[PDB]
């Protein structure tokens, strides 16, 4: 009764509700996953098509924060486009200040701090956007960090953000991704999503994937046509 009206109030049990409510904004968002392998990091996203009128590629949820850093968002996309633009300001301030590629562990900190500064006050609202950041480097290796509305950052071998999580987080555990190669991972990522995706409420989507790793020489890219077609067909053949 009034304790949940602002982010500046604790419940009598200690929970901050306005932060817990911003997390439910992600629970209703579409599912996106990410995975590490020996060679690099792979992304996947379920981008729902709300109408045929929308151009293919619109509402792209995979943002490029830096050349070597990818990003995948699940939540309200209005706030996401603000984060992706602010995450670029941190990567560019790093490039300006320290003059080299921003390490992913540090980029997932500054950003997770900015997400946190909006849970303290009563003059702002918490972000409703949960997002993960993968990257690869020859001197670092496959790195994947998830950030949530509260600003908590964890590393993962694989993760599921958005609506379906416990369903997708169980399907990733079965396969052993440590010794596998990225070219064989892409085929498994699409295999997981179609298994996770079930059509009851929503209708159709567009599978989006990303390369970062040894194949791309560190530059984060979307999966090229032939490989994306090569990977998507395998998940359809393995569907049954």
């Amino acid at each position: 009764t009034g304790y949940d009206l602002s982010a500046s109030t604790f419940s009598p049990d200690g929970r901050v509700f306005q932060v817990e409510y911003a997390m439910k904004a992600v629970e209703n968002s579409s599912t996106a996953i990410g995975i590490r392998c020996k060679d690099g990091v792979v992304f996947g996203v379920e981008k729902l098509v709300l109408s045929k009128l929308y151009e293919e590629g619109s509402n792209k949820r995979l943002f490029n924060v830096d050349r070597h850093v990818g990003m995948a968002v699940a939540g309200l996309l209005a706030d996401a486009r603000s984060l992706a633009d602010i995450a670029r300001e941190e990567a560019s301030n790093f490039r300006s200040n320290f003059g080299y590629n921003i390490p992913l562990k540090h980029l997932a900190d500054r950003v997770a701090m900015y997400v946190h500064a909006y849970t303290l006050y009563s003059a702002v609202r918490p972000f409703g956007c949960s997002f993960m950041l993968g990257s690869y480097s020859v001197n670092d290796g496959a790195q994947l960090y998830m950030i949530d509305p509260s600003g908590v950052s964890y590393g993962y071998w694989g993760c599921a953000i958005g609506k379906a999580r416990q369903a997708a987080k169980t399907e990733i555990e079965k396969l052993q991704m440590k010794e596998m190669t990225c070219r064989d991972v892409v085929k498994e990522v699409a295999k997981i999503i179609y298994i996770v995706h079930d059509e009851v409420k929503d209708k159709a989507f567009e599978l989006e994937l990303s390369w970062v790793g040894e194949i791309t020489n560190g530059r984060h890219e979307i999966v090229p046509k032939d490989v994306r077609e090569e990977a998507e067909k395998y998940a359809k053949e393995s569907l049954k």
Partner: protein, 235 residues
């Protein structure tokens, strides 16, 4: 009832009510449509009459030579965005001396309309937009919202009873690419009539259009220039 009055207050369901109520402001005003071929991109806006004696509001505004918008929402509130868009398109020709990419111009609106949704004590802009433009990557039709989320669309319809106009655009989608100047406009004109009841028809007074294409700059046809396109279309 307590969650309604503020923009920065979430709900138990993770829904911001004021941003939802700002979406209702788009449904409170005249419907507009637009679509693009491989070349041209044409906006068609229905100018609403307060009465038969009073004239019609202007629903289409110039932005840059290659870019134009159709405002549906609070009228004087859309002139805040239009003044912002005109300054961004002039700063692009003043600095880079090149026409501003339409995918960039819509991204600056996503940054401008995002701040009032974030901060307390401010309201989200209650204006939806269709930005028609032409650049090196081809014509574009972009929808925006009060929620600051902008799309990339082949054809859309916003405003009162826009769902019916959206349904029409889906069926003919495959033909939109090969249409010439005249036939393309006729697709949008057929969309407006679906939004309004049969007791009202399209006239030279209440319908304004704009056209941007490969070799043609964005231009607004007011009244007498609308008649040649109106003629030749059965209702």
């Amino acid at each position: 009832n307590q969650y309604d009055n503020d923009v920065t207050v979430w709900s138990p369901q993770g829904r911001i009510h004021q941003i939802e109520y700002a979406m209702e402001a788009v449904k409170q005003g005249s419907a507009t449509v637009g679509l693009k071929s491989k070349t041209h991109a044409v906006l068609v806006a229905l100018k609403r009459a307060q009465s038969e004696l009073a004239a019609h509001q202007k629903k289409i505004l110039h932005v840059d030579n290659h870019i134009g918008i159709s405002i549906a929402g609070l009228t004087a509130d859309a002139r805040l965005l239009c003044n912002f868009m005109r300054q961004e398109c002039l700063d692009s020709r003043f600095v880079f001396d090149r026409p501003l990419p339409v995918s960039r111009l819509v991204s600056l609106i996503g940054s401008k309309t995002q701040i009032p949704t974030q901060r307390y004590g401010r309201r989200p802009y209650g204006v939806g937009l269709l930005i028609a433009g032409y650049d090196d990557m081809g014509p574009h039709i972009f929808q925006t919202c009060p929620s600051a989320n902008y799309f990339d669309c082949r054809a859309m319809s916003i405003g009162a009873r826009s769902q019916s106009a959206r349904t029409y655009l889906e069926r003919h989608m495959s033909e939109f690419m090969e249409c010439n100047l005249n036939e393309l406009v006729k697709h949008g004109l057929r969309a407006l009539r679906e939004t309004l009841p049969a007791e009202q028809d399209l006239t030279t007074k209440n319908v304004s259009i704009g056209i941007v294409g490969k070799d043609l700059e964005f231009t607004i046809y007011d009244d007498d220039d609308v008649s040649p396109f109106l003629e030749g279309l059965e209702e």
